[PDB]
């Protein structure tokens, strides 16, 4: 339907049904000078386990003009847009990465970033992968599904990001992350855990970034969510970052 | 600072520091015909625990459809959010939509739901009046130690029709998360069971694919340690009214 645009400065507008002729996006605020090509978008799309750049780049670098994306169709656009934001944010030394914290009753503890890209579950502990595989098989046998907890983390973000009262950084992240269909809950920092009363502000104080790492936890309802969560986090961070230069 | 406006159709734009001469909001989009006055706004403000002047947008006690200017003299930052939300509640009530909140948890004290009526009978928004003595003595334990603790508020909207929500980016759960998470104390938002039932009437909160079911819409909010309930209700009401007006287009 008609809520097909997101962002203020760094803006994504999108169109297409998954069964129709194509998906199309226009990404609107990307600063000039970024080395960008269809394979940069391909790498992010594949992590989820065909993108044509129609405009907004000249000899392999971004001009400042709107970028048209086209996907031929023989979550796509959200991820492809986010790949542009990640690639830009990388240039400022900002890294947005996600992992699975929980698959149903199996709490998975964090052991390394590197381990995340080595398994199908985005599990940061490779010793839990056998258990996670066997649990999934059990679900596959019973035909029923179950929720998960995704954790998305942005490192190197400077302090100052966020625009109170209504467009607080935690609030804009909540919007973008909760827009994912599976996501029924969002936490910045410790959140609902330790209602009872590194860092548990989760990088955000009074809706402005600390300079600390920004940490969001996502709750996924019973029906590949990590890449689309990272994409949304990157889009919001880039959008807020560009609204900063303006001051 | 500069993120001082919320909404597309039913919109709230604000200004003022809590220490300055005044607070001002302009509420844009309220349908005409609503019986509205300064006392309707006062009732919601006091539940936070005359003041608000309606500068425009009402003629002989009813809303004209033109923008409503609100002014709160500073003889606090949450005031305009609550006063704008009062207008939305009062409209939504007319369509048989009720937005109400309660405290589900004060620190380690889980407090179970017993009645709506009990909510407005105690200082904790506790829906169980049998927990109130415990909740009070917990309070003079914290007050002794000068330290504070968090809470969990539950906000519920009843009577909402199916069809509200605008995918992909302006899904109803998403627009609620934005508005609730904008409250300063709020560090977490769930629609339905959420985080509590990762290991798995209606747990879904009345929202399916980001569109309302017709079922009651239930949101839980995690408040960091540092009165939140009225402001959560106000925010929920504003988003529901905005989405409903936006729906009216076919």
From Swiss-Prot, chain A:
The keyword Transmembrane helix does not apply. NADP(+) binds at residue 48. It catalyses: 5-O-(1-carboxyvinyl)-3-phosphoshikimate = chorismate + phosphate. Gene3D superfamilies: Chorismate synthase AroC. FMN binds at residues 181-182, 206, 221-223. It is an enzyme of class 4 (lyase). PROSITE patterns: CHORISMATE_SYNTHASE_1 (PS00787), CHORISMATE_SYNTHASE_2 (PS00788), CHORISMATE_SYNTHASE_3 (PS00789). Its EC number is 4.2.3.5. GO terms for molecular function: chorismate synthase activity; FMN binding. GO terms for cellular component: cytosol. Keywords: Amino-acid biosynthesis, Aromatic amino acid biosynthesis, FAD, Flavoprotein, FMN, Lyase, NADP. InterPro entries: Chorismate_synth (IPR000453), Chorismate_synth_AroC_sf (IPR035904), Chorismate_synthase_CS (IPR020541). Pfam families: Chorismate_synt. Disulfide bonds: none annotated. Reduced FMN (FMNH(2)). Pathway: Metabolic intermediate biosynthesis; chorismate biosynthesis; chorismate from D-erythrose 4-phosphate and phosphoenolpyruvate: step 7/7. GO terms for biological process: amino acid biosynthetic process; aromatic amino acid family biosynthetic process; chorismate biosynthetic process. Its cofactor is FMNH2. Belongs to the chorismate synthase family. Homotetramer. This reaction introduces a second double bond into the aromatic ring system. This is Chorismate synthase.
């Amino acid at each position: 339907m008609s809520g097909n645009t997101y962002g203020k400065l760094f803006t994504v507008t999108t169109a297409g049904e998954s069964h129709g002729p194509a998906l199309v996006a226009i990404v609107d605020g990307c600063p000039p000078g970024l080395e960008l090509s269809a394979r940069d978008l391909q790498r992010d799309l594949d992590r989820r386990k065909e993108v044509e750049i129609l405009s907004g780049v000249f000899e392999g670098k971004t001009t400042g003009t709107p970028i048209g994306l086209l996907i031929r169709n023989t979550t796509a656009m959200r991820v492809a847009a986010g790949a542009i934001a990640k690639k830009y944010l990388a240039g400022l030394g900002i890294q947005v990465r996600g992992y699975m914290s929980q698959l149903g009753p199996i709490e998975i503890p964090f052991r390394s970033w590197d381990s995340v890209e080595q398994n199908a579950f985005f599990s940061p502990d490779p010793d839990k992968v056998p258990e996670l595989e066997a649990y999934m098989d059990q679900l596959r046998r019973d035909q029923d599904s179950v929720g998960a907890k995704i954790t998305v983390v942005a490192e190197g973000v400077p302090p100052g990001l966020g625009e109170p009262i209504f467009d607080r950084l935690d609030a804009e992240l909540a919007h973008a992350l909760m827009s994912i269909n599976a996501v029924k809950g969002v936490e910045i920092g410790a959140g609902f855990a330790s209602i009872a009363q590194s860092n548990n502000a989760g990088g955000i104080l009074g809706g402005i970034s600390s300079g600390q790492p920004i940490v969001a936890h996502l709750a996924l309802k019973p029906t590949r969510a990590t890449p689309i969560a990272e994409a949304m986090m990157a889009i919001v961070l880039l959008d807020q970052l560009l609204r900063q230069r303006g001051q």
